């Protein structure tokens, strides 16, 4: 190089180009994939990440682990992005996507080092991915009967498969039944905001319950609250968005009087306004009053004197769930509290759960919402239980959308690898090597499963390859018996969309990484 008295780019700009740059990109992708390798399979392990604030997060979820890592390598961030994409679109497979992408890049690295043109590799990946997706759609097993029992069993099996890698895998049948029950009560959109997740410290995992209704924590009761009865047997619920307090009529309001009689009249008028609101609420027949805005002590004592229940400052989403379950309407005005806008539940009760008070609305027959109350011995315990249940919920929702399943345990990918190898053996030969590399790369997941289980990956892979070649589509890794088994008959079921999205995203990430040849890093501005 030369000093170049006036330089072209700003001083401090770093540029890397050529084969070394792409090889380094592949190595960075390998490094990222290594961080989630041991989290895959029933024998997977959890990771603990501590941030600068000292708060530790414990997760088996690949997307969460990748997000927590402060990745700054531009090529490595693609793996995190595709993990986020897989979590958003599907909700499961956030580790398989990264493993597949890194394995693709690793398999094609030797060809890159030989000077092979990246466009050829990109075309080979596109062809292989299209063929693999078509094969998945072709061989996916579906039942065209719409049988309720069969559909529920399929959903439960999919939830169990999605759950048999987390800390709650011991109670996976229990939690899968809970998740299927929760999802089946959503109406048509399967909105996630309609499934509440409450975490209460203390108690065992089996103590966790699903409320066929709505439940939320007690919200800063005022004085006189303890005189209110805490159990009703057919209450009418008045959902309100109203501040039941003595307060200024308006922010800009001002009262100008010149007589003590008018002063007393104004005071009595404020009191009468509050009491008129309370009386309009009371005459509606409602026994439980929930408000999004604060309810004052005067209103609390007024309701206590009438054997009523009040709870102010209820969170908005909890009020929405209460409306969806009991079947009323949130009223910003109490002037027309007809029976149409009043909720109704069979039993309302306030009980204690692990040192916290919760309000229970059970017995709703037309409920379109749920509430999970999760019990655990630690904060991160409950958080990871929530993450596992979220994975199961996404899986069950996707299965509701389309009941197409493929066998897990790597069986689907071994079948895809065999199909792609057979296809590659019938092409000129420049694309043959790359498609064969793709097929070999698809074998990472069963190998990773065997490695995590402490198995002999080579022997299991050889047996799987021979079995698939000689006949058998759903033969995968059997973790319990340290052998191979028909995973379809073992009910290791995954929705086809999970693997479809995984292959698509991994191929797109690999093609994007390979397509780059130069990286330019401008100097940081305002480093401070």
């Amino acid at each position: 190089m030369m000093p170049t008295p006036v330089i072209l780019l700003k001083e401090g700009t770093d540029s890397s180009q050529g084969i070394p740059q792409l090889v380094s990109n592949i190595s960075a992708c390998q490094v990222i994939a290594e961080a989630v390798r041991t989290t895959l399979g029933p024998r997977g392990m959890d990771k603990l990440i501590v941030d600068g604030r000292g708060k530790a997060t414990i997760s088996n979820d690949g997307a969460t682990i990748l997000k927590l890592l402060d990745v700054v390598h531009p090529a490595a961030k693609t793996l995190v992005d595709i993990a986020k994409s897989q979590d958003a679109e599907v909700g499961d497979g956030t580790t398989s996507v990264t493993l597949l992408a890194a394995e693709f890049l690793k398999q094609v690295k030797p060809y890159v080092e030989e000077g092979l043109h990246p466009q050829i590799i990109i075309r080979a990946f596109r062809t292989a991915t299209q063929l693999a997706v078509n094969k998945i759609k072709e061989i996916a097993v579906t039942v065209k009967k719409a049988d309720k029992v069969e559909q529920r069993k399929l959903l439960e099996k999919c939830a169990m498969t999605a759950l048999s890698s987390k800390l709650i895998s011991q109670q996976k049948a229990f939690f899968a039944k809970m998740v299927v029950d929760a999802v089946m009560m959503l109406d048509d959109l399967l909105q996630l905001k309609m499934i509440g997740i409450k975490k209460v410290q203390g108690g065992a995992l089996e103590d966790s319950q699903l409320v066929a209704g709505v439940a939320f924590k007690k919200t800063f009761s005022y004085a006189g609250f303890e005189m209110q009865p805490k159990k009703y047997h057919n209450p009418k619920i008045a959902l309100l968005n109203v501040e039941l307090e003595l307060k200024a009529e308006k922010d800009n309001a001002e009262i100008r009087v010149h007589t003590v009689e008018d002063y007393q009249a104004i005071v009595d008028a404020e009191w009468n306004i509050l009491y008129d609101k309370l009386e309009k609420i009371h005459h509606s027949g409602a026994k439980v009053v929930l408000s999004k805005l604060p309810i004052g002590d005067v209103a609390t004592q007024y309701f206590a004197d009438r054997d009523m229940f009040c709870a102010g400052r209820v969170p908005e989403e909890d009020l929405k769930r209460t409306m969806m379950a009991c079947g009323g309407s949130i009223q910003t005005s109490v002037n027309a509290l007809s029976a149409d806008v009043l909720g109704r539940c069979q039993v309302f009760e306030e009980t204690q759960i692990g040192g916290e008070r919760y309000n229970f609305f059970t017995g709703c027959p037309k409920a379109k919402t749920c509430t999970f109350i999760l019990r655990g011995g630690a904060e991160q315990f409950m958080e990871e239980t929530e993450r596992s249940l979220h994975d199961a919920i996404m899986i069950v929702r996707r299965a509701i959308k389309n009941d197409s399943v493929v066998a897990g345990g790597g069986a689907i990918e071994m079948e895809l690898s065999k199909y792609l190898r057979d296809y590659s053996r019938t092409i000129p030969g420049k694309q043959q090597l790359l498609i064969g590399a793709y097929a070999k790369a698809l074998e990472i997941i069963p190998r990773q499963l065997c490695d995590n289980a402490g198995f002999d990956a080579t022997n299991i892979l050889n047996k799987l390859r021979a079995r698939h070649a000689q006949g058998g589509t759903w033969y995968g890794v059997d973790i319990n018996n340290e052998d191979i088994a028909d995973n379809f008959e073992a009910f290791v079921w995954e929705p086809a969309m999970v693997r479809i999205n995984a292959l698509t995203a991994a191929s797109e990430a690999a093609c994007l990484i390979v397509s780059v040849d130069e990286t330019i890093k401008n100097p940081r501005s305002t480093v401070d």
């Binding site: 065992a204 009262i255 003590v260």
Partner: protein
């Protein structure tokens, strides 16, 4: 073993992946498990000396220098300044046990430490930690089923409080209040039974007010079936004792009314000024006369009041107290059976509470006065007033009494008990032992490790009592095997018998089951962690 990956590329170019990766540490594989296991072992061994009647207390000092002398394991772990993440997990486990049950916050830590200690030597022989966790889950299920099998029911009725008093005494035995043991157990049982929904429903601890004042003696602690207020009569010359008091509860200050909205009252002439003065005087007289009309012998406010109202209250023979807090207002209304009135115009005779005695209490040469309201008709709220020679024993008595209240609450929720002193642990270990023999070989090691970890509680009890742990534990286990009697435990008090039936060492089944469950789940969670990425 640390610093993660560091290659700087196979071409010499910079190789940066994670922001500030050269100042971050990482543990991988079995070394992380060993570090976590030894950290948990250290925490558990610190806790294990405070187990049982002979356990010793810990002296906690916070960052401000304040001193806390306590035996409560949850409190000790909460006040301990830990940085290791597994220690934080132990602290959270203790807090969870305290929240769900309230008793046995030390047994969970010791059990988890023993479980991880056994899992360490199981890992050294080449067993996947997930397999150890599965074996622990199976053994925990077996132990819980056995606990249900050997459980015994007790009577929770108020006509016979002997089993409840025995359970409270067992809970309080390890605490410093064992000098006043029976009195403390009696007051705890009476307090829980007084404020509770009888149909096996919950117990609202907000109805139990626990107050501690230094001075006096620990034996002076008593249960008051009313409310203790940290206030006194407003005017110094009002009578200090009211009998058969008709109590008026008010949340309106004895001041001229003012609108909440921004208001300006315009005085435009001398006649307006005279009218305003007359209105003020008449408002004071009217509120006092309205209070007097209902027949009240005593008025309790929440927002204080000014001199004119004070002198009118004194003049009309109406004792009154001001600035009573909201929770205290609620407790007084509940105990006295009277409603809470928001303004004078709404005050009637039927809203008056009734108390047999309202008195002002002095506390020696201290200038402090506190009000007592008691002798109510059907008081549904109680106050536990704790006295002691120093504030530290007062705090310890507070938390010990909270433990007793939690235990009686658990008995209210479920009335099945299991005899303590290590008898439950020994029987569960035996049951896991037989259930391991039938099980195939691979899970046998995990089940027997679970049994050995369960055996730590009787050994810890024996060691704390000066007795030889292994010999006594083996003898008691052999005695349990010989004659079918799961009530044989460790004679910590050297009463001469190992039968906890006669020694009346009684613990709630819910507490034992919750201990086993929480310990197993935390151990599994720790066993599943294999990487640490501290900054």
């Amino acid at each position: 073993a640390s610093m993660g990956t560091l290659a700087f590329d196979e071409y010499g170019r910079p190789f940066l992946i994670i922001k500030d990766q050269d100042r971050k540490s990482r543990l991988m594989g079995l070394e992380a498990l060993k570090s976590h296991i030894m950290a948990a072992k250290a925490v558990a061994n610190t806790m294990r000396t405070s187990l049982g009647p002979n356990g010793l207390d810990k002296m906690m000092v916070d960052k401000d220098g304040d001193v806390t002398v306590t035996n409560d394991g949850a409190t000790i772990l909460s006040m301990m300044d830990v940085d290791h993440q597994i220690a934080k997990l132990m602290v959270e486990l203790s807090k969870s046990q305290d929240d769900e049950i309230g008793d046995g916050t030390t047994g969970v830590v010791v059990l988890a430490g023993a479980l991880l200690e056994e899992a360490e030597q199981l890992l050294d022989r080449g067993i996947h930690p997930i397999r150890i966790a599965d074996g622990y889950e199976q053994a925990a299920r077996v132990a819980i089923e056995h606990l249900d099998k050997i459980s015994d029911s007790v009577l929770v009725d108020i006509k016979d409080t002997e089993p409840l008093i025995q359970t409270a005494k067992t809970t309080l035995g390890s605490k410093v209040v064992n000098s006043c043991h029976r009195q403390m157990a009696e007051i705890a049982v009476n307090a829980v039974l007084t404020v509770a929904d009888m149909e096996r429903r919950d117990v609202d601890f907000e109805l139990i007010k626990v107050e501690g004042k230094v001075g006096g003696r620990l034996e002076d602690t008593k249960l008051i079936k009313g409310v203790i207020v940290d206030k006194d009569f407003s005017h110094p010359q009002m009578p200090k004792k009211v009998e058969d008091a008709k109590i008026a509860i008010l949340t309106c200050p004895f001041e001229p009314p003012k609108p909440k909205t921004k208001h300006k009252l315009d005085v435009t002439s001398v006649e307006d000024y005279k009218a305003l003065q007359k209105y003020e005087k008449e408002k004071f007289e009217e509120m006092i006369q309205q209070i007097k009309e209902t027949g009240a012998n005593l008025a309790i406010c929440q927002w204080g009041f000014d001199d004119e109202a004070n002198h009118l209250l004194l003049q009309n023979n109406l004792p009154a107290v001001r600035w009573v807090g909201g929770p205290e207002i609620e407790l007084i209304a509940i105990a006295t059976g009277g409603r809470i009135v928001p303004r004078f115009s709404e005050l009637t005779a039927e809203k008056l509470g009734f108390a047999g005695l309202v008195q002002e209490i002095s506390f020696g040469t201290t200038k402090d006065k506190m009000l007592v309201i008691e002798q109510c008709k059907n008081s549904r709220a109680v106050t536990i007033f704790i006295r002691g020679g120093n504030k530290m024993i007062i705090e310890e008595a507070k938390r010990s009494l909270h433990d007793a209240l939690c235990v009686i609450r658990n008995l209210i929720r479920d009335n099945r008990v299991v005899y303590g002193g290590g008898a439950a642990e020994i029987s569960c270990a035996l049951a896991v032992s037989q259930e391991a023999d039938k099980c195939p070989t691979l899970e046998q090691y995990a089940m027997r490790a679970f049994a050995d970890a369960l055996e730590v509680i009787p050994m810890a009890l024996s060691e704390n009592s000066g007795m030889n742990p292994i010999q006594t534990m083996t003898e008691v286990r052999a005695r349990q095997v010989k004659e079918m009697n799961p009530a044989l435990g460790i004679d910590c008090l050297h009463k001469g018998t190992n039968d906890m039936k006669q020694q009346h060492v009684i613990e709630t089944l819910i507490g034992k089951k919750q201990q086993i469950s929480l310990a197993t789940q935390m151990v599994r969670m720790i066993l599943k962690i294999d990487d640490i990425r501290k900054p």
